[PDB]
Symmetry: D2
Subunit: 493 residues, 4 copies
């Protein structure tokens, strides 16, 4: 684990349109903070409806038939993505520092697990550019029919604060591989890594207006993207609550395509026959990764009666080993929550857990005089009606529940409006396949948890989302299928 | 062309739930009319929110893990669809009579071209059932990853009045092939063919609750489907206006998946070098098919200056050969419009054409003392700002425009919020491929028009729709992709 | 299980070319026998090089550009295959009687498991006809590129005697779905079911010369097919020995495509943790199905030391329950071997087992005064150097071996030139995936054996074959991929 | 076009096994010559059966389950191929010099068109590594079925002399992307570029024994590869004559998989309506590229009567503009033939052309006192029975034929045992699609010729080959499809 040997100087703070840096139309700026110390890092230009309109006009111009981006070979789009990957790899130390410092993310994890996922996912997306293929079709009658997988057009992409750099590349990588142009709105909490990457898109040599990055607030710049009459598709990751507003505003405007990656209340099911140490470690890392600020957090762990007491005991032993502090300091194993709103929501939900009669095993309160830190918390004897079993906490809070009947636990696991992910722990082949078939969740891990890679599609059932990201399947939602049917004199097979 | 040798008796008039016939919860009924004579055909049970709730509970029960529909082999779902196709083939005379009598559709076309498309599309969909495959994925790390293409769940399907039986099978065929259960709402104008087909689903031997058909009105039963908290996906075909309300209500409720097939203002481009008789006949059949009540109607025909006068002349000759009357009577070549609302809208738009200074060449008025008949109408010298060049008419009204520059005409062809289809007429290979690449339309025909078959995907760009129906690609929107990742000791390639 | 209420009269005995019945050019005939009674059933026309030349000329004429078979829609090829399936279903009683009577196959199995597999596989193949698609390709430069999946041409298909009707449909079903024409050579032992099916191809209404069936001997008619200068592809199932001669003669003639499905020496591996009764029953049915005359026969069963004695004991109990006799008689549970050559080879190998020091547990000799019956035989304490552990027996002879180390048993399982199939019996998820990855075999069953269905590809590694039959993947070997690259003025993505 | 500013020193001359340099077992060496000057360049180690056996043992060891090559992630195989591409890009000057100097290839073309194709194809193949996917299958019964696309094993690859570096990467790129190990035998005329690339495979960091390169002669080392009992697949490009021996020896040994890319006698068809200057230039470059030493050489150009005389005239004008000499010297536009055997064969065929009564238009003889140079030659009034219209010349010799009827010319175009490629020149959409459908050729160019790119499959019909290289489709022949079927308690859709 190497480290940045100079204190970080932030450089890129402006709106990025046509490969140039712009002040806001209003002239307004907004502050960005470090959540470990609550002190200002810099001022960033505040985009609004007028700035989004300028970015969309630039993206539409770069998408015109006969433009550089539309005329270059599919393989050359790939080359630009692979070139950008090499530049992200070059700037890995300073991007991981900026991610840790701005996002409150453990530095070790930002360097070894977020930036490695950024580089790997970009390289994977580069590889698809010239392998996106349509079909030739043996239609009835004297016709020759084929499909083009065309790009859709201008794609509006709203990035969340929990994985700012990883989620930026999960959106722009497929969008640009398929040949779209993008208007990106990074989260108000975390604009800084997206603007550094804009500087690298210019350096990699993308044509101007292919990538535009407009920082700003959700109700202003985000609503402007969702309601715009010339954006063809909107991708949003964030709260289920705002997801509903994005899909509403797409209907009311121009029936733009909507993909959503939203909250979860993801179950683990640990059967009597499971390797108990393997299940304790994966369900633990499942919930406590990045201070529980993961959509896939393993927030409901159901354990069979016979091993329940031993599971809880070993879970609590593991949760009492954390060292809280600034996530840039060596030895620190848990950083802060992102902001006051999230911190308040987490402590409010912990208080309902205690009050509604869950057993607090450890933690259960704040830590420190500055920074938004929550002690890692474990609740046992949780029941399905409690707020901590129904609502996404998005904090370091583990819920452990008891079951006896496998039919019953799958009913309880599925009794939610969420459906992003699930974990099943068993030694048995039949149980692995039948429980993974029965759970209404987009990702099932068996005997592991939180294993996410570029080659696999990822996304929610039910109110956890619409559509899928990455893998073969994820590139479908950034193309538009065009059928071409040509009359010919006589068809021959 | 055989004919039904007995006058039609209508039998199935009720709500279809769990393979049984139900009265409405309210007790209410609504009338169904013949649009050629304006006389009542029968009374049909009026479904509302209470009837949709009962149908969705039946569909959810039939979709439960361990149910008959979920446990039967993929090949057996196929067998039931192929069996249903054979029963539709058996009842082809009485279904085509009912389609003609209720929908105002020429009998020849209902028998030879709608019922043949119904049978062919069902047989095609049957064939996909056991060939829908997921992926095994070479993920990084010591894991085995695969995808299931699972069914989504309960699918709400709202059928339009223009192609009642064809659009019913385009929706239920893919939905049932992929293993979903369905709640169908046929159009208030045209419920009768959908309820006959419900009787054949029961006879084919589908498990109860797999198909439920709730007739009723759009603002009541249709809004109940779009806003329901336990419908997983809604498919709608109809006006762009109602499409916007369906996608809005999906956002506000449960982020259900939304596919839309909406209006068009579809261009033909006829170049100087085109086979002129071939282009006149296809652009003519393109606009006048089923009294212009096609989403793909060729409602803007752009013709190069040098051949423009000859095109208009030959077009008008062709349009003056029609014989209006009851669409069941032999020799009749144009039937009525569906209802008074549509008839009024068409005559109102024809009046704007005359007033705004388009040249009326023929027709331009109503016909007859009963039935909603419009004379087939041709306008020449149409300009892009006129109401008849901007708004979907959905009537027998042809617009013919002039151009000189190919760059310019593609700009004008693309200057619309619609984008369902386009036709290009040329002898030149370069022009066929480059114009089909440049037009922002989901289907391009070259040297033909209106050629639609089960093997090809069909759907809109822009406000003409979201997603695609039929072909390989159309089945993607009735599956939910589930990733399963299993930890293993050591991976080997 | 219904039965044919009349004694069978054989009708179709001639060469089938251009939908007409031909005598042999030589005038020669050959006898066909019942292997349960060794008495002649009928005389069949003996095809040779002159008869194959006539069939190939008819198949080439039916494959010409502009012919009925080449001009009909892909969906219509499908319709003819689905129509043929319905006629096979109609003649199921008499085809299963003919299969049992001529092939020595248990009637129950011929009716309930071979004819059901014939009908199911044909219906599956029908479904692919209009879904075989090529690609549109985003090639570098100003070009439009696509692929056609064309048919290859005239396909020579040599059918074995062990599954005469099932293997006929596994060959003609994919070949005709992809639009090829066929020259079929059924096995000299078993021509009768193939000629009945020829009568049904004529009745279904295939164009003449699309299917031609030339009965005869392997060294004459079979060698004529493999060496012919105008056959584009040869498919052969049979002995590894003749497989080598077919692929040699394809090289020496016209580099025709060769697919081979050949012998096996297929292992089961039964781990200590396996459900022992489930493993005994599946490994038993695995080896004794159709008197061991299966390429996939489970002819080497490796059992972990700790459960070995109990496995052998329960295996021998199961093998002593068989009732030998005519396979048409109710209650009979084992029929005869096909002919004297096979019968002699089986008894010769049983004698090596005894002599080389394997422990005979039961059987080990002939049965009866007529018919080619072998007692069901079990050998325990078999070692890897014995002839019965190295050579394909193709008779009712089970070998049971001991192991202690899992690393070691997979080495021993893979130490063969064969590689058609394998079975793994375990409760453990890790062991199922890692052992299936490590075994060099085309089909792995886990916790079952001999489960073969139309939706899955099937075929050998190593000397058990080249290429694959059925599933998506199997249709690749009956198409020829044609790339078409067209110059265009400017490409746009 | 940069140039190498130092005279080339050759370094790598030995057999490459396990990432180390070996002398031949025999101790024997063979000379390598420059064909422009006929002088020796160096001595290279002569591999035989003993050296191939050592390489295959190393390749089998590197392919063992649990080895570094088998355990590394699919994405890491990709990374090694992309790393190798960057090292080939670094050594582009010295590889293009070595290609020109050893192969007799124009330096401009070796640098700008062969090394660019090498780099582009490797980068494309890298991109497939982690996107090669099998299937999950909805099989009948209570089973879970999937496929692995496994690597086949040890792949023997015989490279021709005409495109030594390009054809090396077309073979090793797909083979290594799919995870196979390789034993390469470069052509005896041209070993030097393959051994330089071996040095770069070691440097890129491939595990030892994954790539082994054994230079030597065709009858010794090539026959050893084709007959070896532990090579799983053999790929050969070269003469149709040797192709037949390779496929024969695969049958007689171990039924190893055989892919062949062989000769052609490729037609162009130029219709009356074609852009004549575009057709003259592409048919010219089609035949004269790399001194006609292309399998796809446009060796039969059929021109419609009305434009025939003008075509021949403009063709001869173009062919008289060449400047012969050493292919490293600036300004030179045609290099030598490869060796004396090829040179003699070309002059012998030119003499038959004159004698059998073709009209010699230009050239028709040797040039120079050293080097194997042939004057660029044009024949008009060629008929289908002449040796120059039937036999592959593999020299700079253009044949131009007359036709009147389009039905007739396609018959004549198809009347050959060859079928690698074809060119069609027309302005008409119908003619482009119908003539490309009718020609029995693996690649059809329309209005261009010789356009070959990594994204497209390439390969022959008939005796021009078995199987396909590059594109999606080409990777199928370097995987082995393994079906895995697992018994489960109850299946749910
Ligand atoms: Cl998928
Ligand atoms: Cl598609
Ligand atoms: Cl497969
Ligand atoms: Cl392909």
């Amino acid at each position: 684990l190497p480290v940045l040997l100079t204190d970080l100087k932030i450089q890129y703070t402006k709106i990025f349109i046509n490969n140039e840096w712009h002040d806001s139309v209003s002239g307004k700026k907004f502050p960005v903070f470090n959540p470990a110390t609550e002190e200002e890092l810099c001022q960033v230009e505040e985009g609004d409806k007028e700035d989004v309109d300028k970015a969309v006009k630039a993206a539409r111009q770069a998408f015109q038939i006969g433009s550089p981006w539309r005329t270059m070979d599919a393989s050359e789009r790939g080359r630009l993505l692979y070139k950008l990957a090499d530049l992200i790899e070059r700037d890995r130390l300073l991007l991981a520092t900026m991610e840790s410092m701005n996002g409150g993310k453990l530095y070790s994890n930002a360097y070894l697990n977020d930036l490695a996922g950024c580089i790997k996912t970009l390289r994977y997306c580069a590889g698809w550019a010239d392998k996106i293929q349509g079909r030739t079709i043996p239609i009835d009658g004297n016709f020759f029919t084929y499909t083009r997988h065309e790009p859709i057009g201008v794609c509006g992409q709203i990035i969340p604060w929990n994985f700012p750099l990883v989620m930026l590349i999960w959106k722009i990588g497929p969008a640009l591989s398929c040949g779209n142009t993008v208007v990106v709105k990074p989260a108000e909490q975390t604009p800084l890594t997206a603007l550094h990457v804009a500087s690298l898109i210019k350096e990699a040599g993308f044509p101007p207006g292919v990538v535009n990055i407009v920082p700003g607030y959700g109700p202003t710049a985000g609503a402007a993207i969702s309601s715009h009459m010339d954006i063809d598709k909107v991708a949003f990751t964030g709260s289920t609550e705002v997801g509903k507003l994005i899909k509403e505003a797409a209907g009311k405007s121009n029936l733009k395509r909507v993909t959503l990656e939203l909250g979860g209340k993801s179950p683990c099911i640990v059967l009597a026959d499971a390797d108990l140490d393997n299940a304790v470690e994966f369900a633990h890392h499942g919930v406590f990764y990045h201070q529980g600020q993961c959509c896939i957090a393993a927030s409901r762990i159901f354990v069979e009666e016979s091993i329940y007491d031993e599971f809880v005991r070993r879970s609590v032993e593991r949760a009492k080993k954390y060292i809280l502090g600034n996530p840039l300091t060596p030895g620190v194993t848990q950083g802060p929550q992102i902001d006051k709103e999230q911190y308040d929501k987490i402590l409010d939900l912990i208080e309902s857990g205690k009050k509604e009669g869950a057993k607090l095993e450890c933690g259960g309160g704040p830590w420190g005089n500055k920074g938004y830190f929550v002690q890692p918390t474990v609740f046992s004897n949780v029941t399905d009606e409690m707020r901590i079993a129904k609502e996404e906490i998005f904090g370091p809070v583990q819920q452990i529940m008891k079951f006896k009947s496998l039919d019953d636990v799958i009913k309880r696991a599925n009794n939610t409006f969420y459906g992003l992910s699930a974990g099943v722990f068993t030694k048995d082949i039949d149980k692995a396949i039948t429980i993974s078939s029965a759970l209404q969740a987009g990702t099932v891990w068996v005997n592991c948890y939180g294993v996410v890679s570029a080659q696999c599609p990822f996304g929610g059932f039910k109110m956890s989302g619409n559509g899928r990201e990455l893998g073969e399947y994820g590139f479908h939602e950034y193309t538009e299928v065009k059928t071409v049917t040509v009359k010919i004199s006589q068809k021959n097979s």
